[PDB]
Amino acid sequence: SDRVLQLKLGNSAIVTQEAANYCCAYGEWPNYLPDHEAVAIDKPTQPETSTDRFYTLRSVKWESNSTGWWWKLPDALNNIGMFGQNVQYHYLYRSGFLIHVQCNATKFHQGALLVVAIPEHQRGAHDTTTSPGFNDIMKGERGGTFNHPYVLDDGTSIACATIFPHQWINLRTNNSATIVLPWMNVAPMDFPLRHNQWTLAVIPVVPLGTRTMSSVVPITVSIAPMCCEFNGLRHAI
Amino acid sequence: SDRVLQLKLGNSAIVTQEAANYCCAYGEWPNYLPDHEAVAIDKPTQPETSTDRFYTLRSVKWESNSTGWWWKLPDALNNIGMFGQNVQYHYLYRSGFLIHVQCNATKFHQGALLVVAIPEHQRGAHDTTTSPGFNDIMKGERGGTFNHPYVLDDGTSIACATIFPHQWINLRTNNSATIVLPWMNVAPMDFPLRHNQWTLAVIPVVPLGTRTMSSVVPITVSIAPMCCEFNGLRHAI
Amino acid sequence: VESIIKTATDTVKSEINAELGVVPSLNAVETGATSNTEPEEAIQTRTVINQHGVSETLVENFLGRAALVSKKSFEYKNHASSSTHKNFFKWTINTKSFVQLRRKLELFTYLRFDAEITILTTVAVNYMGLPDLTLQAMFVPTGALTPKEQDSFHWQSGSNASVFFKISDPPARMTIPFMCINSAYSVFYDGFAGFEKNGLYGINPADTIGNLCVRIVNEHQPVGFTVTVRVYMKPKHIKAWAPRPPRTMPYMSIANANYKGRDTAPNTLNAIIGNRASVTTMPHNIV
Amino acid sequence: VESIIKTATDTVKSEINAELGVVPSLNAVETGATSNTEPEEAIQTRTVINQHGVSETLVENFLGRAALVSKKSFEYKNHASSSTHKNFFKWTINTKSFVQLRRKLELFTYLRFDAEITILTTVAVNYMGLPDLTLQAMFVPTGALTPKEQDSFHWQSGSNASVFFKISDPPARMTIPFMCINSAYSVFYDGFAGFEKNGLYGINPADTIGNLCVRIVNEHQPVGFTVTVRVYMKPKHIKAWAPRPPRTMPYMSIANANYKGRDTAPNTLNAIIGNRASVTTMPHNIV
Amino acid sequence: NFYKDSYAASASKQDFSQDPSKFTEPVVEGLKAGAPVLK
Amino acid sequence: NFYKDSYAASASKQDFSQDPSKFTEPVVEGLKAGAPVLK
Amino acid sequence: GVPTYLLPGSGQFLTTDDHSSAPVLPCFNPTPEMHIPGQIRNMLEMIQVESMMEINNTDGANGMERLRVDISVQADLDQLLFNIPLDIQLDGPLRNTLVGNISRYYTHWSGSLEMTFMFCGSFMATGKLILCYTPPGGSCPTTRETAMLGTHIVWDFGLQSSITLIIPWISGSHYRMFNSDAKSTNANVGYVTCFMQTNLIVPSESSDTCSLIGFIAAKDDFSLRLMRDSPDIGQSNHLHGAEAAYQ
Amino acid sequence: GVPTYLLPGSGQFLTTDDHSSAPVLPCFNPTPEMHIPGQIRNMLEMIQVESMMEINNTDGANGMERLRVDISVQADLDQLLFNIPLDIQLDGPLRNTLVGNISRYYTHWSGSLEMTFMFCGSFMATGKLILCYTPPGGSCPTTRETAMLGTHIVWDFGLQSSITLIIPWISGSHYRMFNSDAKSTNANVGYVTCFMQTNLIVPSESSDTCSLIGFIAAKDDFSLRLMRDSPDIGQSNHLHGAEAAYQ
Amino acid sequence: GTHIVWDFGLQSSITLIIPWISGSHYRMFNSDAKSTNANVGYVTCFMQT
């Protein structure tokens, strides 16, 4: 009942038969920008189904020595489908996100992944006073990897990361995690190419292990923008 | 409809068939001094038609290298007609002004004149600490010329001169500019021979140009005092 | 036409337009009126309830700041053999000596306001301690009789207003009312303040608040000190009329609007704005 | 779900439980929800009317403290032959230089607040007495024009807010309003504040209150002094959003979250908590 | 204001009245929106 | 507050509103007490 | 008496403070007020008046030549005529305007701007131009096909001599700000470019080079915050006669 | 005027004082508020969220290995698996948690704590554990027969992956406090121990060593008092770039 | 394109709907598989994990 779920947006749908309810970040739900909070005065474009749909990124392999993975939003999708086109042709964007992380194995496998959506995850660099560079931050669809997941690569800690919207994928329990993210920013809209509102982090707190037949165990991420709005139309960047 | 206009005061009238509406400085209209603002207690003389009429000054020639012209009020009229006589015989005067600047050419000519009425246009001298002298300021009916119109001969700028009551004479559009000026001062009346309330400035921002038959293109100024009042009668100065 | 505005205007959503005889984006600058084209008429807009306030640009606030108008340092000592401000000075009040305040006031033609005056005093030994001196600032009307010595009997101030203050106290402060003989001060004056022809141009004496005579009350000490008096003025209860083009050329004198311009742009006589390579060259272009 | 809480919740007495299908102590951490097991369901409880208040943990109080944000000492003297803060300094305001305040602010993602600023000044002779100097602290907007000399005319402060105070007076104080161009300050910023790619990461200029320019107004004395200015900031009228994991690794820079960790636990990169002999070793065991 | 002279009072920052048209549209005949300004 | 700008006022320590569930139970379907969370 | 205690801040002189103070001249009767034309109550009234942009700010252009942009009959199609940097907070064509000068006394701004261009060629001259506003993000467009994708107005020369290009307030944040970095995400406004839509066409006796005068102003949805000293004026010495005020 | 007199305390600067003060920018209009997700009004809201305990804080355990406790199939009965010191005011497994970090900004605390453990072995793995909370007074129990006499929960591994052990507020005084003495009667909370109730049992193809992740949080009957500087952060030098803020 | 992510479990089957998406009311056969009035598009299957 709270273990099965179907998500449908646009021409895309996803089902899971081993869910663990699902998370609504801070108890909120995505919505379009109301007139009393608006700033940009040009009429926005709300493409709906062409952008508010699931985009599945390339999978990653969960290995015995993996440290974890991360994908920044909207960066990870800024070059995918019609969402990517609207982002490139407009100075301003706004949207929520429906995140679905997938990972199945066997009744003989064990492992636990923390799936957390971090707002404003400003990364820190290790053992240097030099700030992270553009290429250390903007990885796009490929996403990045954690150097020191123990401190969330920002000098804090993964132990307290549960203060952020999250779920876990504990192999003996479930095979997917779902998190609904509302627009999260101090401004009603933003320039999509230089600021990432959220960072999706998937970290193996309990390593993958088994004594049965060894198989490649992938982790897949599907993300659907929600209530997309774009302002400041011009040429593509 | 707003391109044709007839101005009639006293025994004088002027028509234009290429006007551009007309300006009422600061949205005001000339009026006689009310009892609740009066200071001088002697009964004033209000000559009406003998002074409130159009006085046409000598024309000037618009040349390819002209820098601009100016006429200070009431100085420019202090020695013309009955207005001039009342000014010379009375210590105090008060009046508004109806200004009509004229300049026609050909459908093959181009040029644009900024016609602006500047209140308290205190001139500055160029490259010296010595203040302008009496003869640099009081030109009378002949008016003066701009040395550096770019900074309105006062160290500011013509670019922002549009903050003052004005119109333009853009040859392809109109052949005249009309500005109605109300009494402008911090006192209800003043001594006409030592203080000029307004300065009429005509500056060619876009030089006169054509490839057709070269002809002398004049600029003519006609000014009609309005609601004239004089106090402090004595002998003529 | 007049109305109460407390916030920036809202925007109303607009639709597609294709009407003959209706051309909101066209105007006629020749009329002297500024374009009345609204955003809603130029593009398709959304509805926006604008809550941005407009109070920081109220004239009262724009000019309502205590700005430095006078700074004078002199030697406090035994002036037996001095040629020099001998333990006191006189300052003909004017708001044309310090450029930041001057340029702002000159954005207007006429101004009516009361003036809050604040006086700050500082001392330095010409080391064995800083004396807590008592000073006297006497307001002497424009062109009136000012003291000629630190101990002149003129300082008895029978009618003139005088304020006595100590360097250890907070800066002295008092308000001079709008005291012009006219309904407003003339920031600019296109005339001569005298009945003859040799008078000064652009100087209406009616706009000179007056003289400020400041002395150290204490007799001199065995050693000399440098005393600096700074006067600040803050206009309030302000009414302003006829805005003007802002000053661009550097000021040359406090007595006139004479100009020369900087040696090279920006703000040079033949070029106010700094140059760019051409009219198609975009400065700070995003690479 | 939202409600007014003024005291810790009461406890209700509970009885024995033996119900099939009811397992309050079991949960599913995978959902992301924190356990909802109540004490009454885990053990037999008594009734307790809890009067313990919760006001000291209100965000307004938690962050409502004047914390040191800037400490600057310079030499006040004749700087004729100085290479050095010549009787004045400029400080680009930031709340990242002192760790106690920084760590607390960083417990949140976004913060909206007004800032009460208090300025404390101290002096020491480089003995014959301590001078009661007058200082000027001028607020110059972020990236704006700051003075280059103690006597620069920039200090005339025509529009910038300036506060003049004496060392003998209580510390100066004033409130800077929430001045961000956004609805809240970004304590953390996962982006680049420029349209090009070489800009600084994690630094949103919109979150920099501005520059604080402080000078000694007095001309130099015959001897030199060391003057130290301390600035404290207390946020008030606070609204906070999205709490975050507390900082564990020592801070390395004010410009980023770079980390290295201590040389040995606690708070070392591979071990935040100090070690114990084994998971069955009880530290501080009662003997 | 505890002083007897009203000019001694603190600032008066409550005058929100405005009339930009005296500077932006000082034309005798009001210009209608959309209509050709010159006719 | 004797100052004219409201932001100058003293602290506001009277907001006792709370909603821990936005952090402790951000699940779409409320979890019933005693009932198995996963069903 | 009343028990009291002094708070931090006591005795300080804040230049922006607002208190009553001792009247120097008791019982003084100020001159009666008189109606005077042109009263201004909010500086926003001043910036709504359009003023001339110094678009031709190039070496070789002197004085008023800098206030007009000359366009000529082209030999090629879709030609770029000129562009205009838009930071009303930095030096450029927009700095010495009413909106630019007043805005520079502040640090934050928000609202729509309007640019009006008046064609000053002869009556017999015709033409169509396209004025484009490109929101920020990339490099300034150099071809009409690219510029045309942004906000724009196609202008046909005729009896109505002027066209208005509205630069709508399009920003992520409520306000934009100055911080001396023109490429900052909270400062850059984008670009304005002008291309021939068709071409300037004139007969033999009309000048074949005509001028445009560009004006700019703020609309009534404008707002300015955080006052600061203006960078447009300064002094390094006493002005002439200043010291004489003490003699 | 009004006769007054200054009281002791006059002129002082108390960092915790609460007064209004002069507005630096008069007539400033702050940016309008906008709804933002996740507003927090009382720090007690934050500590009610469970976070990971660093139970395996031992030499040889690096990084995340310290955040999980491995349990193996036992050869003997009633085996002790691990224990956890409980002073959320001292360094130990509970210090770097949400409740621990925030509580360390205070000196006094009261309320129930909750520890939740999630079993992360394979589906085919079964087992029963007993988690015990022993109120203070003696030495930490080392045998199940002794630990079992305290507050406890017997946990059966199954579909519901996690169990919660409530550490009820059991104290003589209203509040407990920190004073750096772990054995003080007003500080010591007691102990938490974990033993096999039966045993971890797994088939040949399942890993025979499984991990548990322990979490802790405060319940809503919690209260914190007497704010103090946190011992978890400090500096002995200027941070890099701090001095550059003056250049 | 249009899709469904399928998770193997108790419910053994998944359904992919191929919605009628055509410009014309009907599609037709004319022996030319690449005709604009005949080609329906494609169905592909990939490993999600």
Ligand SMILES: CC(=O)N[C@@H]1[C@@H](O)[C@H](O[C@@H]2O[C@H](CO)[C@H](O)[C@H](O[C@]3(C(=O)O)C[C@H](O)[C@@H](NC(C)=O)[C@H]([C@H](O)[C@H](O)CO)O3)[C@H]2O)[C@@H](CO)O[C@H]1O
């Ligand atoms: C080198 C290059 O590529 N181009 C230069 C161009 O940068 C230069 O422009 C000047 O550049 C400076 C920056 O160095 C300023 O932005 C100048 O602007 C202002 C300012 O905004 O600060 C305008 C202001 O009005 C000026 N004030 C006064 C009181 O005069 C100030 C002032 O001069 C400076 O602050 C000096 O300290 O400058 C801007 O013009 C132009 C010059 O032609 O040349 C290019 O080659």
Ligand SMILES: CC(=O)N[C@@H]1[C@@H](O)[C@H](O[C@@H]2O[C@H](CO)[C@H](O)[C@H](O[C@]3(C(=O)O)C[C@H](O)[C@@H](NC(C)=O)[C@H]([C@H](O)[C@H](O)CO)O3)[C@H]2O)[C@@H](CO)O[C@H]1O
């Ligand atoms: C000797 C022994 O039996 N066991 C040690 C064990 O004591 C040691 O633990 C450290 O011990 C000290 C007491 O000496 C502290 O309790 C350390 O904790 C904290 C503190 O609470 O004060 C945690 C805090 O986060 C730390 N702060 C910072 C800013 O780094 C401080 C800090 O380092 C000290 O105050 C230093 O002055 O410590 C606690 O870890 C462990 C180390 O592995 O080793 C055992 O052998």
